[PDB]
């Protein structure tokens, strides 16, 4: 039961199909419609949106012909119905209750296949003879046309997001995408199918986008061994030109279906009852500039809860029930996957491109660095250089990348491994990776590195690190270095040197006065402050505490000459308020 595909614990529930009622699904708005008695008694609505399932019950008569699709507008204001190959009626919806008097009837000769909404107020129709594009008007009760094309069509396919419709020609050996939007429809470069003679069927072609780029999927069997495979073409060429980029190696036989869950191409095998994941961005073997891929985990079934041939699979992760009356959504359990995959580099690569791969990635790094540590070195040498590249790419470009780990994320990781013998090597490896990718070290990492270097009695490394300015040159870092000052004196030397680097003179003066070097502090102050701002009181008190009778005389004489230069006198101005020192000097040194 330890599996990687599960279903929703709270599935949506709706009315089961019967001999009279029919069920119609809309992929564009993820809505299932269950018509009753031709819509006269009320059609129920089930799908996404509000937490309560939105249902609109409406009445509409019996005009003959089975419905293949009824679809609201993207703003849910107008719906449509199709009955016959030559009579397709455009019905108008008003408010929250059907104004049945406003229905519009339309007639077309062409072989009708289906209709789509290209905008909130635009309906586009697909017909065999050749496509077109119409626009409705309820006022005059007619529908206008703008453009067209012209291509025989056997079967079609539609995309709601990119509005790119994949059409198969009636010639049976040509596939051409068309980009359809407001007033503008144009052909795309014809897809290089590779084999213009292979037979194409309905269960052999699927269209869906991964990682935000639209791609086409074709099922195939090996031309040498006969084993089944999947042919992948990505619409990433200049001008949305189709281009083959990937091939998947299934190495089984039978029927297969493809969904797209969390940007993973899931393949289902009904016969063996197993599912296969394929991650496109993972490093795989490349042959003839075409990358070949293999399942990342051994084949396993969906988690047993709640492979019947009755389902209908809709992109991206929609599975519905015909005779059961339910509808789930697929999901991934990353906790079992973090244990199934053993290669740490592969697991990091897989998790760096998920949607929840942050809480699990940080846990993996924490387990690898703290609990299960071994002599691992070359593994965390690569994990760093793997995510620091993403962090650098985020900065140099300033949509942020999915899963992004900064310095403050993994500083918290290194906290629990502090005061251990092997912490220095890990910190130095991290700093080496950052330096290799040209990223500055912030305050907290610098503080941690300084603490570990000081504790482990390594001073040459500290001197070399300060020399290259690999630690943040902040006043807080200077205070951190200076607060120790007692393990050794080289720490004090480094602190003073890097304090003088950033020109923080007040702290240097305070420290020098702390040791008891009054003359040097005064010399520095008269150059920093400027001889009109030096505090006489502080220096006189500091020189008086030392009790030396020579420093006191020199300081007193310096201030006397300052008074002479400023005020042309040898007396102390009343503003200073230092008559006590004058009395002390007069008593100490008799005239």
């Amino acid at each position: 039961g330890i599996h990687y595909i599960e279903l929703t614990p709270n599935p949506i529930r709706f009315d089961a199909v019967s001999q009279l009622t029919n069920v119609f699904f809309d992929d564009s708005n993820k809505q299932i419609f269950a018509v009753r008695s031709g819509g006269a008694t009320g059609v129920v609505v089930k799908g996404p949106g509000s937490p309560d399932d939105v249902v609109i019950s409406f009445c509409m008569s019996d005009r003959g012909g089975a419905i293949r699709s009824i679809k609201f507008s993207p703003d849910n204001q107008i719906l449509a119905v199709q009955r016959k190959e030559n009579s397709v009626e455009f019905i108008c919806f008003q408010g929250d209750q059907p104004l049945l008097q406003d229905i519009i009837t339309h007639q077309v000769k062409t072989l009708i296949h289906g209709f789509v909404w290209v905008h909130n107020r635009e309906v586009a129709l697909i017909s065999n003879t050749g496509v077109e594009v119409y626009t409705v008007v309820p006022e005059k009760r007619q529908v206008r046309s703008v453009k067209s094309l012209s291509i025989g069509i056997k079967w079609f396919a539609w995309c709601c997001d990119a509005n790119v419709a994949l059409l198969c020609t009636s010639e049976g050996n040509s596939l051409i995408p068309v980009l359809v939007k407001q007033k503008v429809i144009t052909k795309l470069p014809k897809v290089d199918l590779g084999n213009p003679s292979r037979d194409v069927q309905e269960s052999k072609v699927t269209l869906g986008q991964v990682y935000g780029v639209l791609a086409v999927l074709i099922l195939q069997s090996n031309s040498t061994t006969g084993l089944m495979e999947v042919e992948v073409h990505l619409l990433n060429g200049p001008g949305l030109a189709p281009r083959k980029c990937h091939v998947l190696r299934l190495s089984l036989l039978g029927r297969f279906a493809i969904n797209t869950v969390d940007n993973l191409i899931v393949v289902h095998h009904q016969a063996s009852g197993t599912s296969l994941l394929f991650d496109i961005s993972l490093p795989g073997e490349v042959i003839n500039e075409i990358t070949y891929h293999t399942p990342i985990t051994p084949g396993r079934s969906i988690k047993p809860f709640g492979y019947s041939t009755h389902w209908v699979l809709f992109q991206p992760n929609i599975v519905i029930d015909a005779k059961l009356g339910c509808m789930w959504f697929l999901n991934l359990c990353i906790e079992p996957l973090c244990q199934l995959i053993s290669d740490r580099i592969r697991l990091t690569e897989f998790l760096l491109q998920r949607s929840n791969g942050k809480q699990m990635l940080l846990k993996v790094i924490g387990q690898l660095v703290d609990d299960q540590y071994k002599g691992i070195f070359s593994r965390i040498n690569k994990i760093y250089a793997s995510w620091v590249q993403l962090e650098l790419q985020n900065q140099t470009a300033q949509t942020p990348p999915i899963v992004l780990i900064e310095q403050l994320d993994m500083v918290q990781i290194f906290q629990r491994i502090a005061r251990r013998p092997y912490t220095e090597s890990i910190l130095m490896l991290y700093l080496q990776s950052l330096n290799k990718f040209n990223i500055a070290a912030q305050e907290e990492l610098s503080k941690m590195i300084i603490s570990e270097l000081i504790s482990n009695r390594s001073f040459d490394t500290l001197r070399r690190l300060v020399s290259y300015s690999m630690l943040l040159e902040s006043k807080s870092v200077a205070c951190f270095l200076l607060s120790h000052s007692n393990v050794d004196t080289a720490i004090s030397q480094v602190a003073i040197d890097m304090l003088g680097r950033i020109e923080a003179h007040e702290i240097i003066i305070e420290v020098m006065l702390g040791q008891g070097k009054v003359i040097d502090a005064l010399r520095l102050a008269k150059n920093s402050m400027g001889l009109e701002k030096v505090p006489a009181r502080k220096f006189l008190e500091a020189a008086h505490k030392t009790k030396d009778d020579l420093i006191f005389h020199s300081v007193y004489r310096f201030f006397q000459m300052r008074n002479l230069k400023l005020y042309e006198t040898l007396s102390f101005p009343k503003a200073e308020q230092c008559t006590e020192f004058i009395q002390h000097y007069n008593n100490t040194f008799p005239a």
């Binding site: 070195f377 130095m428 490896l429 700093l431 290799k436 009695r457 030397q493 003073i496 070097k517 920093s528």
Partner: protein
């Protein structure tokens, strides 16, 4: 006709031995040269003891430091209580009659040399403390030491400094990465990496031990592709507040010497460990050495900037009179000394927190202000991050 300083004698004696009459030859534990008669050895030891006991009537006995006769000068030194080292020297002569000039000798340099001799002996063999018969035969280590110039001595030899190796950040980070050996191999307690002669990355070791290791390596391995084997060598270095024996393993890349300190309270390492270390370490070390060599290939007033906390100087090194002045005025607050000699040489000295700066100029048409400006120009040119707060 200059004669300059030579070496006349060197001996070690302990007055405790041979207190009974007839055992006057037991005082000497070593005498150089060994060709001298025993009576002369006893007479010299007696003179040294007489001088020491004459000094010991005014102050403490362990204060005697020198003797200056008319043509010979002796220097005393006591590393441990009882044992004395003596270094007899010869005064330079001038012939015009003999003009002895014993006033051209600075005691600090040669007393530092006396200190270094005992430091090296302690590094290799241990402390000085019948066992005296074993000691007297183990002290014939100081026979090749004084066989492998007295006149050529300066301030650098007085302060025991090693030049500085500048490297860019990336290469230094790569070189410091060789600290995972203590984790992959749990036996190794310490590692030090040297370039050809400058210390590249030596950490968790006091400057004295690092100087001893560097001097021993340079003297033996460098002068006379893998593990160099000598014809299990133990060293005595202090780690974690105690001096303990350690095995020394020396691995030689192209220009890189890597010394590894194995624990010495167990059996000697086997051949499998050497093979594992070689096969695990050779290619990375070779590549690093090649990269460093290529980078270094890619990259008038004198000066000498000495550091007192790490003993790494930086200079571009002057007549004998000038060289004598630098060794005189050397080592507390900051200071600033400017001196002009008769032969028109200006000498400037600074002393910041823990450093010493020297600049030597040769200009006979300068005043005090001009000399100060020139020294400031040199200091700004050859240094960054102004340290003197000149502004």
């Amino acid at each position: 006709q200059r004669v300059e300083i030579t070496l006349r004698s060197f001996y070690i004696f302990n007055s405790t031995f041979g207190q009974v009459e007839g055992e006057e030859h037991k005082k000497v534990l070593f005498y150089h040269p060994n060709d001298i008669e025993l009576n002369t050895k006893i007479k010299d030891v007696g003179l040294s003891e007489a001088i020491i006991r004459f000094t010991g009537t005014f102050t403490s006995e362990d204060d005697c430091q020198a003797l200056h006769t008319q043509k010979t000068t002796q220097l005393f030194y006591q590393p441990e209580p009882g044992y004395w080292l003596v270094l007899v020297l010869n005064v330079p002569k001038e012939v015009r009659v003999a003009d002895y000039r014993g006033a051209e000798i600075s005691d600090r340099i040669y007393r530092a040399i006396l200190r270094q001799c005992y430091q090296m002996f302690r590094f290799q063999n241990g402390c000085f403390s019948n066992p005296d018969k074993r000691r007297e035969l183990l002290c014939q280590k100081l026979l090749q030491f004084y066989d492998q110039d007295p006149a050529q001595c300066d301030i650098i030899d007085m302060l025991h400094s090693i030049q500085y190796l500048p490297l860019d950040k990336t290469l230094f980070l790569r070189a410091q990465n060789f600290g995972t050996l203590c984790e992959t191999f749990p036996d190794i307690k310490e590692s030090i990496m040297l370039y050809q002669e400058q210390v590249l990355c030596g950490g968790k070791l006091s400057p004295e031990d690092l100087h001893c290791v560097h001097s021993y390596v340079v003297q033996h391995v460098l002068k006379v592709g893998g593990f160099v084997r000598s014809r299990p060598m133990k060293v005595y270095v202090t780690l974690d507040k105690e001096a303990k024996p350690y095995y020394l393993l020396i691995y030689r890349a192209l220009h890189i010497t890597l010394c590894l300190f194995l624990n010495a309270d167990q059996v000697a390492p086997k051949q499998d460990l050497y093979d594992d270390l070689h096969a695990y370490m050779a290619p990375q070390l070779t590549s690093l050495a090649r990269d460093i060599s290529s980078e270094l290939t890619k990259e008038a007033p004198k000066y000498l900037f000495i550091n007192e906390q790490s003993l790494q100087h930086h200079t571009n090194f002057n007549v004998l009179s000038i060289i004598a002045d630098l060794a005189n005025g050397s080592g507390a607050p900051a200071e600033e000394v400017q001196v002009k000699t008769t032969n028109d040489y200006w000498i400037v000295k600074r002393r910041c927190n823990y450093r010493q700066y020297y600049v030597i100029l040769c200009n006979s048409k300068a005043t005090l202000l001009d000399v100060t400006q020139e020294a400031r120009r040199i200091f700004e040119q050859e240094l960054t991050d102004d340290v003197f707060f000149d502004k």
